[PDB]
């Protein structure tokens, strides 16, 4: 017998109270209109004309107010969501900015200048429907059980589906019809996405890029980057007898061609590349910040780029000749995208377009002028931004020429068939892959996903895995910084990459540090490093959403801190025993020691998909061994929202489970508390809904017993 | 039958680890009648079916054996005089494989190699040691061709057929009799069937194009029926014999084995209107008006 | 690979023995046994899976592959070549499946759902390729089959 605590089932409601099921869709927007709206503002703040350098614009601050409507004339009154849903209006609020323009000779600072409108969420912080009471919710004709999270544009409910994509700033090593090939996709904060690939054929490496015409040997690029001596090249590649025998052809090919100096290498690159200012300068600028944008250069030093390319060559060497390849179905690398980043790109593009438009309308009026004062307020319109936002949300065709991207089918009409179909629409996630019959891996159930995406929840038909839903316990990490992280890393004793040479990285004891696809440096004793980092994370100095893992096959530590990662809370164990005791849960039952206090007292912690790869997790408490590091809170959390309505899911078969998950959103029943007031296109009601006798804990968690869609017979 | 023919490897077990596609892919390749076939398997029988030592002797005959795998060790010796490459042929590995390759056989295989070499500086020192001196001419120095001849010495085949890749012998048992059947994985049947070991009379192939090139067009209509029936009995289904006999005679009456593709359908039928739906925007439609052929409505 | 098949047949013997011992203890009035004997809708494998044990959940005729680091699930150990660890289900449908066993049973559920959902496209390609080829082959009145020409 082992001391068991049958009280950890009340941790899940306390965790769902703060965030979880549908609140993250609102946190993605609340953090967006408080940080990213200011980020794009400080991005583009000063614009100047070209006629005479005396006129210029400045921005002081920008913010968004409350949902308002402009009626007949000079009347701004608070509008209700049901009012817009009945009048086929659009739920939006104006954007108030503080502008500064210099007309004539003096400077004018006109505060509170309206430049446009912007939609507001139904349950956001700026909306009215927040922090209210059910008695007050009934006064506004709105269902209190409505989870929200959709957009109201022209009297329809539109939801933006979460879309998964591949991670950027990383090296992939795949296999194709010829052999093995390495690739690197890079996308920085500014608008430039690149995809370079190293290919191998008849024992000769070649580099391919979109702006390059023909393939160029990697040794030529090495000599062009700045490393002159050919010995240091092989030294950086790898200190091994079998990696040197595979690098011989490249060396003899570089020796065959009359290329021995950096100038000759740059001349060869200029002759090879075609762009539609001499050849040396364009070849130098093409290698600086064009092929790899995620690796910054201080002035003209290609040392870090050389190190990264050497690690890439060593990776493609260790891959070739073995049976190890990297697959894209791994969910530890695949990232998620909510409605926040799409709106960020859209708003940035619209703001840049608006700044470039007025710059062009006021440049041919200053020379051909008839007055001495030119006001920019009269030559200003606020209809383009609102029209663009409304059309982008309604149509759902994200078209961004500045980013050079076109996407269709992102926003969908919120299905109001039942109470489960409406909530289940908010948890739906679509993939970027098209309707391809040939692909079967991504559609197939992957061992990587465990408690993050419900396996049973999937549509039956053509889409047999492309559409997935989230689990009950799931959290998406937001964006953060890297200053304190790199500071603590340098204080731990990490060595700089500019000090050691190429022969040290081949040493087995030597370990490399990777941070968001960037080589931080070299460190010894990585175990103590990871231990101290985890201790500091449990302390409270560094944020809790920082992932750190190690790879012994590649001999490097990965530090992931970018936004859009998957994590679920796990209980910590102390060498034979869970830290959570009965006295800690009695206080939670009392009303104190919430989830925040538990996270601050080093009781539970979040883990990533790749972070749980380097740890042992126990299902129950009787299975806990001496090697387990974390403990599962509840095992019934793996099932999804539509899968929580099936009595005894383990007793039933997976095809029947999937069928019932698909038919649960098809059953008709009660929609909400105000179904006679709302007027939708098609609506179904039942007469006398009964209550399920054998209910589930998930039913009570969502309070499905108040709006059942069936009857006992 | 093809509707319910979408399952995975059926007779999968550790007894026979042989990757042979059977299902809708095999039927699709048979209907398409493509030249290049996937996973070639070709079976032959021996004259001596009692002794297994003869089977092991003739197994090494039809098999592509390289020089580097048989060579004990190769080394480059450098001295004040001209350097040369030295390879030590191991006789024990030849005796264990029961091969009939001697030092003169290696010399003749090297002189008949594809890389630039002529019998001027290639000699045998003793029993199973070969010395090759590279020349200094016509491309570059001898140092660069030295690295070029050391990585192709294993590539130079010493015996066998370059077409055949892998061979294994299968044991058949009965009431009291034992049989040994030699199945190899290649394409050139004309070379394996014309061998002293395997009996050329009793030998079956899988490539329809190669078996109609070697045996004939009339002998290809029989092997295309057996492969189809062998795929239908592997699924637990049953078709009639003349149903597939009529399909085998449909691509055998006019010329050679014609496949059911977009190009073969134009050779079978001569109607532009039915090809209008198969092909693209306006190519055939304008070439028809250019040439001016008469379409028969039948 | 030799060891993967040596223990694969030892896990089937216990299942077959349980299924055969269940038949001697069953009554001659059970509806499932009656339907299996008649053959209307069911089989003996379903009875042995619902009563005795499920068996082994194989994927593409192989064992459950690893997905994190040389291990299928993170709840197991490193390089754990154990039957119950990799893909072996022990409890039947009546008793109750383990979440790890439920995941392995659901893994085989989707592999069979995706091979019939896309099979319509290949079957339609082959049907159009075969129909357009043979649409005029008929028999004449002199016991001879000819073409349209």
């Amino acid at each position: 017998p082992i001391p068991t605590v049958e009280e950890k089932w009340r941790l899940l409601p306390a965790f769902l109270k703060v965030k979880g099921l549908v609140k993250q869709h609102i946190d993605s927007f609340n953090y967006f209109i408080n940080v990213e709206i200011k980020k794009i503002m400080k991005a583009n703040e000063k614009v100047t004309s070209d006629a005479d350098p005396m006129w210029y614009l400045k921005y002081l601050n920008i913010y968004v107010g409350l949902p308002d409507v402009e009626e007949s004339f000079n009347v701004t009154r608070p509008v209700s969501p049901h009012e817009c849903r009945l009048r086929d209006m659009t739920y939006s609020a104006p954007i108030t900015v503080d502008i500064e323009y210099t007309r004539g000779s003096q400077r004018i600072i006109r505060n509170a200048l309206p430049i446009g409108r912007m939609p507001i969420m139904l349950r956001s912080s700026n909306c009215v429907l927040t922090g209210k009471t059910p008695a007050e919710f009934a006064k506004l004709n709105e269902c209190p059980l409505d989870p929200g999270g959709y957009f109201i544009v022209k009297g329809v409910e539109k939801v933006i589906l979460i879309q998964e994509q591949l991670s950027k700033n990383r090296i992939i090593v795949e296999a194709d019809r010829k052999g093995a090939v390495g690739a690197s996709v890079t996308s920085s904060t500014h608008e430039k996405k690149s995809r370079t690939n190293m290919a191998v054929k008849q024992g000769r490496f070649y580099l391919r890029h979109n702006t390059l015409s023909e393939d160029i040997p990697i040794v030529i690029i090495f000599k062009a980057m700045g490393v002159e001596s050919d010995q240091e090249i092989v030294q950086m590649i790898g200190t091994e007898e079998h990696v040197m025998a595979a690098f011989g052809p490249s060396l003899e090919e570089c020796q065959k061609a009359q290329i021995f100096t950096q100038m000759q290498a740059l001349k060869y690159i200029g002759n090879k590349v075609r762009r539609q200012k001499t050849k040396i300068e364009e070849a130098r600028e093409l290698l600086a910040s064009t092929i790899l944008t995620h690796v910054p250069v201080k002035e003209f030093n290609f040392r870090a780029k050389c190190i990264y390319t050497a690690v890439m060559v060593r990776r493609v060497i260790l891959a070739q000749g073995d049976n190890k390849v990297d697959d894209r179905d791994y969910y530890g690398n695949k990232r998620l995208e909510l409605a926040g980043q799409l709106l960020s790109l859209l708003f940035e593009d619209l703001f840049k377009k608006f700044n470039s438009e007025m710059k062009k309308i006021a440049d041919q009026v200053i020379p051909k002028q008839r007055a001495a004062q030119f006001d920019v307020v009269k030559h200003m319109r606020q209809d383009q931004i609102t029209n663009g936002m409304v059309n982008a949300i309604s149509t759902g065709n994200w078209s961004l020429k500045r980013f050079k991207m076109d996407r269709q089918g992102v926003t969908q009409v919120l299905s109001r068939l039942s109470y489960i179909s409406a909530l289940g629409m908010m948890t739906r996630i679509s993939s970027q892959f098209e309707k391809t019959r040939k692909v079967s891996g991504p559609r197939s159930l992957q061992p990587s996903q465990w408690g993050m995406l419900c396996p049973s929840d999937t549509p039956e038909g053509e889409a047999c895995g492309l559409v997935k839903n989230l689990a009950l316990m799931t959290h998406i990490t937001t964006d953060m910084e890297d200053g304190p992280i790199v500071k603590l890393a340098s204080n731990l004793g990490v060595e700089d990459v500019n000090l050691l040479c190429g022969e040290e990285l081949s040493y087995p004891n030597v370990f490399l540090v990777f941070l968001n696809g960037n080589i931080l440096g070299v460190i010894r004793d990585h175990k103590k490093l990871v231990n101290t980092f985890r201790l500091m994370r449990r302390a409270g100095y560094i944020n809790e959403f920082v992932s750190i893992s190690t790879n012994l096959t590649d001999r490097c530590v990965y530090i992931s801190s970018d936004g859009g990662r998957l994590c679920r809370p796990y209980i910590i164990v102390k060498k034979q025993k869970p830290a959570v005791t009965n006295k800690h849960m009695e206080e939670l039952a009392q009303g104190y020691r919430n989830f925040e206090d538990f996270l601050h007292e080093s009781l539970v912690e979040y883990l990533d998909v790749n972070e749980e790869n380097d740890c042992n997790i126990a299902l129950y408490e009787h299975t806990i061994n001496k090697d387990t590091t974390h403990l599962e809170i509840e095992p019934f959390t793996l099932l999804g929202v539509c899968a929580g309505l099936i009595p005894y899911p383990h007793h039933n078969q997976s095809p029947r489970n999937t069928y019932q998950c698909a038919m649960g959103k098809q059953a008709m029943g009660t929609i909400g508390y105000n179904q006679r007031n709302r007027i939708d296109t098609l609506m179904y009601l039942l007469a006398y809904p009964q209550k399920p006798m054998v209910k589930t804990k998930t039913i009570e968690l969502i309070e499905f017993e108040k709006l059942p869609a069936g009857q006992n017979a | 039958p093809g509707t319910q023919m979408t399952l995975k490897t059926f007779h999968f077990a550790g007894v026979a680890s042989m990757n042979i596609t059977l299902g809708v892919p095999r039927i699709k390749e048979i209907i398409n009648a493509s030249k290049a076939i996937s996973t070639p398997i070709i079976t032959a029988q021996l004259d001596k079916d009692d002794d297994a030592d003869y089977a092991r002797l003739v197994k090494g005959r039809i098999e592509k054996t390289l020089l580097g795998e048989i060579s004990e060790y190769i080394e480059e010796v450098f001295l004040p005089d001209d350097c040369f490459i030295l390879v030590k042929l191991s006789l024990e590995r030849i005796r264990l494989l029961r091969l009939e390759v001697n030092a003169e056989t290696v010399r003749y295989s090297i002189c008949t190699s594809k890389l630039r070499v002529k019998p001027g500086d290639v000699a045998v020192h003793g029993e199973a040691v070969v010395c090759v001196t590279p020349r200094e001419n016509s491309k570059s120095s001898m140092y660069y061709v030295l690295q070029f001849l050391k990585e192709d010495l294993p590539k130079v085949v010493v015996q066998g057929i370059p077409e055949v890749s892998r061979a294994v012998i299968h044991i058949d048992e009965q009431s009291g009799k034992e049989k040994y059947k030699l199945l190899v994985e290649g394409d050139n049947l004309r070379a394996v069937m014309a061998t002293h070991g395997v009996k050329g009379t009793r030998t079956t192939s899988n490539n329809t194009y190669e078996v109609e090139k070697t045996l004939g067009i009339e002998a290809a209509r029989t092997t295309i029926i057996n492969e189809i029936q062998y795929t239908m009995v592997n699924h637990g289904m049953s078709i009639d014999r003349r149903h597939v006999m009529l399909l085998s005679d449909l691509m055998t009456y006019k010329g050679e084995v014609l496949g059911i593709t977009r190009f073969g359908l134009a050779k079978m039928k001569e109607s532009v209107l039915m090809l209008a739906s198969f092909e693209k925007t306006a190519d055939h439609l304008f070439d028809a008006a250019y040439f001016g052929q008469k379409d028969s409505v039948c | 690979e030799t060891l993967e098949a040596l223990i694969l047949k030892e896990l089937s013997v216990i299942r077959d023995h349980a299924g055969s011992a269940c038949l001697r203890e069953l009554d001659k009035s059970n509806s499932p046994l009656t339907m299996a004997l008649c053959g209307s809708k069911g089989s003996f494998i379903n009875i042995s899976q619902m009563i005795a044990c499920v068996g082994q959940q194989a994927i593409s005729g192989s064992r459950v592959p690893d997905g994190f680091e040389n291990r299928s699930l993170p709840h197991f150990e490193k390089h754990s070549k154990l039957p119950a660890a990799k893909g072996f289900v022990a409890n039947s449908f009546y008793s109750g499946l383990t979440p790890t066993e439920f995941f392995f049973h659901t893994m085989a559920g989707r592999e069979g759902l995706v091979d019939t959902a896309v099979k319509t496209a290949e079957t339609g390609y082959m049907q159009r390729r075969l129909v357009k080829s043979l649409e005029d082959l008929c028999s004449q009145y002199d016991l001879t089959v000819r073409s349209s020409t």
Binding site: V413, L414, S415, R416, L417, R437, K438, P459, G461, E462, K665, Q666, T681, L682 | S34, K35, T261, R262, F263, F278 | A117, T120, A121, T123, G124, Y125, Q127, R128
Partner: peptide, 30 residues
């Protein structure tokens, strides 16, 4: 004979259309 793909070359017919019913709720004539 060129190495083409059946999917992109042969355009989808009524054969390819898999008639299956799913919930997907929510020209001049004389």
């Amino acid at each position: 004979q060129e190495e083409y793909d059946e999917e992109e070359q042969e355009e989808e017919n009524d054969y390819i259309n898999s008639y299956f019913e799913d919930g997907d709720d929510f020209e001049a004539t004389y």
